[PDB]
Amino acid sequence: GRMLLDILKFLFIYCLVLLAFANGLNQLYFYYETRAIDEPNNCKGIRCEKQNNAFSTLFETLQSLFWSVFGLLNLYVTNVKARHEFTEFVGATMFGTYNVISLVVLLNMLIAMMNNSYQLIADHADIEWKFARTKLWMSYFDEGGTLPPPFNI
Amino acid sequence: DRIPLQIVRAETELSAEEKAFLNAVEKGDYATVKQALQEAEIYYNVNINCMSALLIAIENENLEIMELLLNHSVYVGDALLYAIRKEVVGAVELLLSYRQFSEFTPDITPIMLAAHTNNYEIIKLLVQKRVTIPRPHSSEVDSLRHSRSRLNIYKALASPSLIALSSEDPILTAFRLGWELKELSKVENEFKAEYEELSQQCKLFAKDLLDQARSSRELEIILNHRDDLAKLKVAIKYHQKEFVAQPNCQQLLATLWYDGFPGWRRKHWVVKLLTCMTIGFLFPMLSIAYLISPRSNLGLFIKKPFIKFICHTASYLTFLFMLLLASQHIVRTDLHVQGPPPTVVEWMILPWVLGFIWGEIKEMWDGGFTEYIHDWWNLMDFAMNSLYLATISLKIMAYVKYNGSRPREEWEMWHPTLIAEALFAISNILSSLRLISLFTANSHLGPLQISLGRMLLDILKFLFIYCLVLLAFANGLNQLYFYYETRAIDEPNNCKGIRCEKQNNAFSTLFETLQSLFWSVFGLLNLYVTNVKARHEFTEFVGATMFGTYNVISLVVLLNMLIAMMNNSYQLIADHADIEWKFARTKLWMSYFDEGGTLPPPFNIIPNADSLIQNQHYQEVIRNLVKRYVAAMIRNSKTHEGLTEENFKELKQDIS
Amino acid sequence: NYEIIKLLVQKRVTIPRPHSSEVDSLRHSRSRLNIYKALASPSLIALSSEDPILTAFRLGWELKELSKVENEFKAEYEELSQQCKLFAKDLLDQARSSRELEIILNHRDDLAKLKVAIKYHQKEFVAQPN
Amino acid sequence: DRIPLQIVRAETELSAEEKAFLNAVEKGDYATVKQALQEAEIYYNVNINCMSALLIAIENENLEIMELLLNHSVYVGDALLYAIRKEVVGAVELLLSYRQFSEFTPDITPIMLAAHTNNYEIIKLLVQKRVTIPRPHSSEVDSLRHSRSRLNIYKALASPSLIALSSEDPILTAFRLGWELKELSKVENEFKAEYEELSQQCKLFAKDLLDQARSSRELEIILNHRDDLAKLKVAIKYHQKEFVAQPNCQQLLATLWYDGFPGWRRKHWVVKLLTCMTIGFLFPMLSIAYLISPRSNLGLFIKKPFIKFICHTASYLTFLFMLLLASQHIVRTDLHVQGPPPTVVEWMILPWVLGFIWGEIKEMWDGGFTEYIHDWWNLMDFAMNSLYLATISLKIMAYVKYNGSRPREEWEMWHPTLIAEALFAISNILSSLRLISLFTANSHLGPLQISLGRMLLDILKFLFIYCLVLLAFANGLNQLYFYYETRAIDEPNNCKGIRCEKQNNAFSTLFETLQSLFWSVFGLLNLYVTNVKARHEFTEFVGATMFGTYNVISLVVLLNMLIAMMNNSYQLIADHADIEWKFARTKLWMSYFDEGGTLPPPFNIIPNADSLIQNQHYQEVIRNLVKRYVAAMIRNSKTHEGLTEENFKELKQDIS
Amino acid sequence: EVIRNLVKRYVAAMIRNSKTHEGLTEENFKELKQDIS
Ligand SMILES: Cn1c(=O)n(CCCO)c(=O)c2c1nc(Oc1ccc3c(c1)C(C)(C)N(O)C3(C)C)n2Cc1ccc(Cl)cc1
Ligand SMILES: Cn1c(=O)n(CCCO)c(=O)c2c1nc(Oc1ccc3c(c1)C(C)(C)N(O)C3(C)C)n2Cc1ccc(Cl)cc1
Ligand SMILES: Cn1c(=O)n(CCCO)c(=O)c2c1nc(Oc1ccc3c(c1)C(C)(C)N(O)C3(C)C)n2Cc1ccc(Cl)cc1
Ligand SMILES: CC(C)CCC[C@@H](C)[C@H]1CC[C@H]2[C@@H]3CC=C4C[C@@H](OC(=O)CCC(=O)O)CC[C@]4(C)[C@H]3CC[C@]12C
Ligand SMILES: CC(C)CCC[C@@H](C)[C@H]1CC[C@H]2[C@@H]3CC=C4C[C@@H](OC(=O)CCC(=O)O)CC[C@]4(C)[C@H]3CC[C@]12C
Ligand SMILES: [Ca+2]
Numbered sequence A: 001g002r003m004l005l006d007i008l009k010f011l012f013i014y015c016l017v018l019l020a021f022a023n024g025l026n027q028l029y030f031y032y033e034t035r036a037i038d039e040p041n042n043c044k045g046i047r048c049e050k051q052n053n054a055f056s057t058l059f060e061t062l063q064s065l066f067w068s069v070f071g072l073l074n075l076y077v078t079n080v081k082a083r084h085e086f087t088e089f090v091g092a093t094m095f096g097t098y099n100v101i102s103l104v105v106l107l108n109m110l111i112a113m114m115n116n117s118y119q120l121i122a123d124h125a126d127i128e129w130k131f132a133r134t135k136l137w138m139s140y141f142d143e144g145g146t147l148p149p150p151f152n153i
Numbered sequence B, D: 001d002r003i004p005l006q007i008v009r010a011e012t013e014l015s016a017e018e019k020a021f022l023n024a025v026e027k028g029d030y031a032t033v034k035q036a037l038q039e040a041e042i043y044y045n046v047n048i049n050c051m052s053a054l055l056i057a058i059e060n061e062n063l064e065i066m067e068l069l070l071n072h073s074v075y076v077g078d079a080l081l082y083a084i085r086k087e088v089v090g091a092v093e094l095l096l097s098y099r100q101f102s103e104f105t106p107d108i109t110p111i112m113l114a115a116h117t118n119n120y121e122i123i124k125l126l127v128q129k130r131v132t133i134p135r136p137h138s139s140e141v142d143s144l145r146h147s148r149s150r151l152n153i154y155k156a157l158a159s160p161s162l163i164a165l166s167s168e169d170p171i172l173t174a175f176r177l178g179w180e181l182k183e184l185s186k187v188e189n190e191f192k193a194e195y196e197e198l199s200q201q202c203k204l205f206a207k208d209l210l211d212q213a214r215s216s217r218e219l220e221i222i223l224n225h226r227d228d229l230a231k232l233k234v235a236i237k238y239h240q241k242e243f244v245a246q247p248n249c250q251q252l253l254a255t256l257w258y259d260g261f262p263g264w265r266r267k268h269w270v271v272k273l274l275t276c277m278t279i280g281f282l283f284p285m286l287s288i289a290y291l292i293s294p295r296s297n298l299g300l301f302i303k304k305p306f307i308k309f310i311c312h313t314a315s316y317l318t319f320l321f322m323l324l325l326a327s328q329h330i331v332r333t334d335l336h337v338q339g340p341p342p343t344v345v346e347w348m349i350l351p352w353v354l355g356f357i358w359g360e361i362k363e364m365w366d367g368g369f370t371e372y373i374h375d376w377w378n379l380m381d382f383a384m385n386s387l388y389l390a391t392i393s394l395k396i397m398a399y400v401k402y403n404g405s406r407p408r409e410e411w412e413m414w415h416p417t418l419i420a421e422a423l424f425a426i427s428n429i430l431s432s433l434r435l436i437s438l439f440t441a442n443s444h445l446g447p448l449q450i451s452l453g454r455m456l457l458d459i460l461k462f463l464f465i466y467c468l469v470l471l472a473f474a475n476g477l478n479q480l481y482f483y484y485e486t487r488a489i490d491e492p493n494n495c496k497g498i499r500c501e502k503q504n505n506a507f508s509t510l511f512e513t514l515q516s517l518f519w520s521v522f523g524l525l526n527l528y529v530t531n532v533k534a535r536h537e538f539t540e541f542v543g544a545t546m547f548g549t550y551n552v553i554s555l556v557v558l559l560n561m562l563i564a565m566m567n568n569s570y571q572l573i574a575d576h577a578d579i580e581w582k583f584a585r586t587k588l589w590m591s592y593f594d595e596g597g598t599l600p601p602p603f604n605i606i607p608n609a610d611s612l613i614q615n616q617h618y619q620e621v622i623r624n625l626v627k628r629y630v631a632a633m634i635r636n637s638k639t640h641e642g643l644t645e646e647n648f649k650e651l652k653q654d655i656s
Numbered sequence C: 001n002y003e004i005i006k007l008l009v010q011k012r013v014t015i016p017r018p019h020s021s022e023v024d025s026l027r028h029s030r031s032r033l034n035i036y037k038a039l040a041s042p043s044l045i046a047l048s049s050e051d052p053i054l055t056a057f058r059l060g061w062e063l064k065e066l067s068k069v070e071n072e073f074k075a076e077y078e079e080l081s082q083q084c085k086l087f088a089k090d091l092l093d094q095a096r097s098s099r100e101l102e103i104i105l106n107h108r109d110d111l112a113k114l115k116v117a118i119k120y121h122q123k124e125f126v127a128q129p130n
Numbered sequence E: 001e002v003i004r005n006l007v008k009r010y011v012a013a014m015i016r017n018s019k020t021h022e023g024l025t026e027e028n029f030k031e032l033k034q035d036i037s
């Protein structure tokens, strides 16, 4: 818990990069949005067995780029039924550039600064824990609140 | 069985009579040396070769015998150099008043050696005479001696005691010298360890000299001095990051940044964000007030550097929030039009686009090709406006060559409308990525943003290593699989490539093979792409072994190396992070101090007797700063390991 | 220096109270740091403080706050706060009995003294083996 | 605006005449103090309740005034402690001749304080007067005083000068004391910092004492001494890793490991393995030769510890390739046999299984029950042999309840033959994993294998935090998705669960939900499992958000935490890796020195007057080791910051 | 009363640790300057 605040600062850097690429992908793919009727077994979105409409809306595009961090977005979502080649290649290049920035650059940056923080924390770990345990102990010294919640009412 | 030992470097042995002479000198026996020097019958006396009975006298810095040799015509030679190194003032002026093996290179001069020791008293004593340091730039005739001579000269020029004694503007020469020594650590790529130490020494001297300022009046005299915040701009030019990030320099800068506005708030960070959003909402009111009335209670409120920066940020934020409302609020069904006119947003986003190009060109007059490329954030700015020019031009071309409406599935492969849409979308990514530069103004995200970009250069070195391993394996896989390329007709759903449900023709062409190995880094290439219709087991196994070997090299070896150098680089960077961020934030602040381009891009599209006194004031403050610095450094020069030797010498006088 | 400080205090000396910031910003900042550098002296606290332990608690926390508000001079204030935290910890290290330790920790200014240490985030003081 | 300053704790001030007295003793004046003392019989009340001048006399170690004060009946108090701390021998024995505030705790005695200083001369002076040390065991009162008293006693017993002077066997007491102080660093968990330093100092004393051995005869006397390689076995039981890993101790062990057979130090790396292989191939003929002719030319060859290690390894290796051959030799005839008898392989590997069980029992009782547990390679051995007992027993049971042959597709759900096959395969993994322990014998893979196991405990602590996060999220997903559980009939290929081609029912039950979140760590759970047939968009989105939150916590936060502490641990471990590996290799070597269990498991199932002189020899060597250690320690105790003070003392005599 | 004892022990220890080789050599030299006998 002592270095979850450093994670929060990083998660604001990532959210800005996520928003930048989600704007470009949605601005390129929203022309080809299809209704759920035209998709197999009336399923639309990336939660289907056959993923579709990954970048149709901004709300869907933000979820698609989140699940690509864990590799759960298939590559055929960059294809559209019109098959204009140039449009599909540009979209796949936006997707590929986002993967390089996130999974090769930003996440490795998080590892590097997480190692550095742990070195400083480990020296003071014993003092920090004993201070925290003291506050736990003194909370049970008081007479009030002895009974557990099932009986304290 | 045994290793006999002899003396190979034979020497001329000193006689027992000569040894007694040097023993008497070493013990300060005036009587013995006097009689031993009284034999003026011309025998065993000092000649041009000598033996030397003066270096030991200098070594003990006993002035009695030292004067006894000088009037007996002893060859002094380089004796002055030995006295200077000992840092004994009495012996130096004695040899001065009397004006083959050596421990000094023949290029060493008495003034050069004194500056190497950084002894203020001896350096001052020597400069009261004619002394001239040779000017640093013949390298082919003797390269070893030329390199050593150049380093010896710079080692003397970079002496704090010499700069404080003989420089009209010690601060400026320390700026120039530190820059020059930094350049020499690269061009003279062999002696970089010594030049970097010299450069770091010059940077410290200027920083420690301003640490002797005792009032704000003195500090503003120094920083506002013009050779012919001028002095602070020179420090930024020479990359004096420690000098700029001083607490007193940063404190003065913050006074001009917040100006009248009480922006010094540091309490309840929540209300800081709420208050900051207040000015941003009413930013157009401030811009028009200045436009129609420069002099007003509210007219000059935008002139505040901190207020101006918030107004420009909110104006830019409107642009990004304006393009975002173009695929969710405007285009409903006007997509079958072959060439569409600019839409309602496009007409009302156009003035923002023009302001960016005009603002970029208007600031392009200052500077030029240089000093502009080296700022990597301007490289991004060039790409956005170049792409914004292409889509605008490509939109009006399709407006004249097309009139009707056709379904998108029937358009050409490279329709101009499709091309413009692709270029416009790429610009939106670059526009939003520019918000990262705004993180420098924040004290929490500032140091992190500076650290992130400070080691992107090590990434580029690695990506060149990887790009060659990728090209090596792509050649082998394509050379093995191009025989089995199939047409899109035979594939299901008329889909060819790795962007299909069933990936196929992964290694058919070199262009496709390079993409296939890229997507395998993220695990997006399935294993069945190593299979072909002919079902030749030997060929398919070899291809899968090439694919497997590439995965091991990339995902187990190369990417783990990349992690390893981030850890090493980040440790070095983290120590200097605060100084690096404050230097970057200073350049952000000074960009809003000057009176130029104060209006946002949506609005900017509309088209001596005193100098003698200022130099006198600067010299008076400089004299006081040097006096305090010299007095302080003299006190810290004394040490217990030095006082013991002096205390022992005074205690030698027990003859009374 | 304990001996010289005691010699001067006997002559009825005083120290200005730390808080004018616009007439001379450089001189005002240096004057404030000089005052806190004297108040945070272990020899001065031991000689002229009614409750040295409480004084080091308040002073060490005050200097920690100043290391943020005076964001420019944080390096000098951090080592002043660490100095005050050490003094209180070292002072209680001289206890030779459990009766002495119980008197200190249960004293009410009006385990009261230990609750004050938790309030001021005296982590080294709290985590002492005794 | 002002802070008045006052003296709040002011004591009685020394008057002018008393202060003059104090500085007279300080400067060493005798006549002043003598005359002042000679006239101070009426106005100065020197008694048991007066103030003292003795301490300053001790401070400047001026014995003349010190001697003077005892002549006038000055209350000495605990001035002997002050003399001992100063480490001045002359003042100590002078104070010993004559039979409220203190800087020492009341529990400190002169002998205890002398041992704290580790001054050999003063400790020897005090011990000659029949002193004692209290034996260490809260109390009725002052738990603070008990803890300090106990640490003060152990700080004196752990003094190398005291051990060298008053221990019959200094090596043994340093072994016991270092072990005892290590235990106290945990039980007295509050004062662990001081006890660790004491334990490390004791372990160093024994190591430095054997460093004074000057011949192999002396080293062999020490290491083979039985108090009642016996002394080396005691060092292993007390975990004296630095003592064992000494180069001279390791050198002696190597000569016993290669019992006359070539030392194998000048062989090539590739050649090394070639002549290791030929000995392994000859293991069957070596075992039988020792069985029939133990005293033959080749019968005693297997007695060499290194040869025995190779023979046992090859015998075990034959078993592992033998199981590997079981699945590539049995015909598919037994596929449909319900209860099959043991095959050709199973019957011919049965004796080798019993050898492992017999060997396990043989060494189980030798070590007891606690020594066996504290060896993580024995837990694997117990589990591996237990599974072989169940596999053999379950095959016998299936041989009596089944006679016919039926296809496996219609077999029972929990058929005993199926259960035995699963248990047999699990033990095959454990048997092959046992080969990792053989890495200790290698100088290249040894320290790495020891490093890997040295911090698996840190993994176990981390995996307990992860299991609680896993249980938390598996609770919500099952609480949200159990309404939509579907039967296996309604699924396409009668398949239910996440092990199907189309994954389904991922969060239907708690047991299934725990497996689903495990496989998502490796990315093997598809995203469509968050979808249900009811198509309720709200619940499906909530489930995907809880699934996504679990991925962020596990794969971005927890696993990156693991990398961080795993890197920090490796830095500390890598420093001690060589010592840790050599301690482990020593235990491996000594296990082959004993005669018991010489034959491999395939063959192992076949069914005082002199002690007075040895103690005298050990004491003589111990006397020489201590004498060399004391002389070296005394010489190394000299320092520049100690020699200067005594030089000033002699120089200050100046009586001529 | 306890505070008085704690401060007294702390001051006595602080004075002892204030002594150093780098400072003791100074007044040791100064005392030897009194060579007038
Ligand atoms: C971001 N990115 C991506 O999105 N895709 C998928 C496109 C659609 O699938 C990729 O294939 C892809 C990719 N970066 C890739 O490596 C490169 C490519 C070029 C460069 C570099 C790396 C670096 C930065 C080192 N540099 O010097 C240049 C020359 C600019 N490659 C592989 C590839 C593909 C085709 C060719 Cl001709 C050459 C290489
Ligand atoms: C690169 N590579 C690969 O491409 N494949 C896929 C082939 C087509 O699917 C693999 O299976 C594969 C693989 N490296 C693998 O580990 C090995 C295998 C051999 C070695 C080593 C590692 C090292 C380098 C340590 N060394 O000492 C040798 C003996 C040369 N294995 C697994 C495997 C497969 C078959 C056998 Cl018989 C044995 C092992
Ligand atoms: C946990 N999590 C998740 O489960 N999904 C899948 C849902 C079902 O598929 C996601 O898409 C998803 C996700 N965290 C995501 O990033 C975010 C989103 C919001 C925040 C943050 C990170 C942090 C913590 C930095 N913070 O400041 C807030 C504002 C709370 N995003 C991407 C996303 C999706 C929709 C929108 Cl509107 C915005 C972003
Ligand atoms: C439509 C999308 C793309 C907008 C992205 C939202 C945020 C990531 C942006 C919008 C407003 C930005 C902020 C605008 C103004 C400020 C105040 C600024 O305040 C300071 O600390 C500097 C002034 C001072 O304290 O002296 C720091 C940067 C910050 C938070 C900016 C950081 C980035 C923010 C939060
Ligand atoms: C055969 C395949 C399935 C590999 C699995 C077994 C190996 C892990 C084992 C088998 C034989 C073992 C070796 C048998 C004998 C020795 C000699 C031993 O060396 C010495 O005692 C002297 C040389 C030195 O100082 O290193 C080092 C360990 C080693 C190589 C052993 C290391 C582990 C080995 C290679
Ligand atoms: Ca620009």
Ligand SMILES: [Ca+2]
Pocket (backbone or CB within 6 Å): D360, D377, D378, D381
């Ligand atoms: Ca075992």
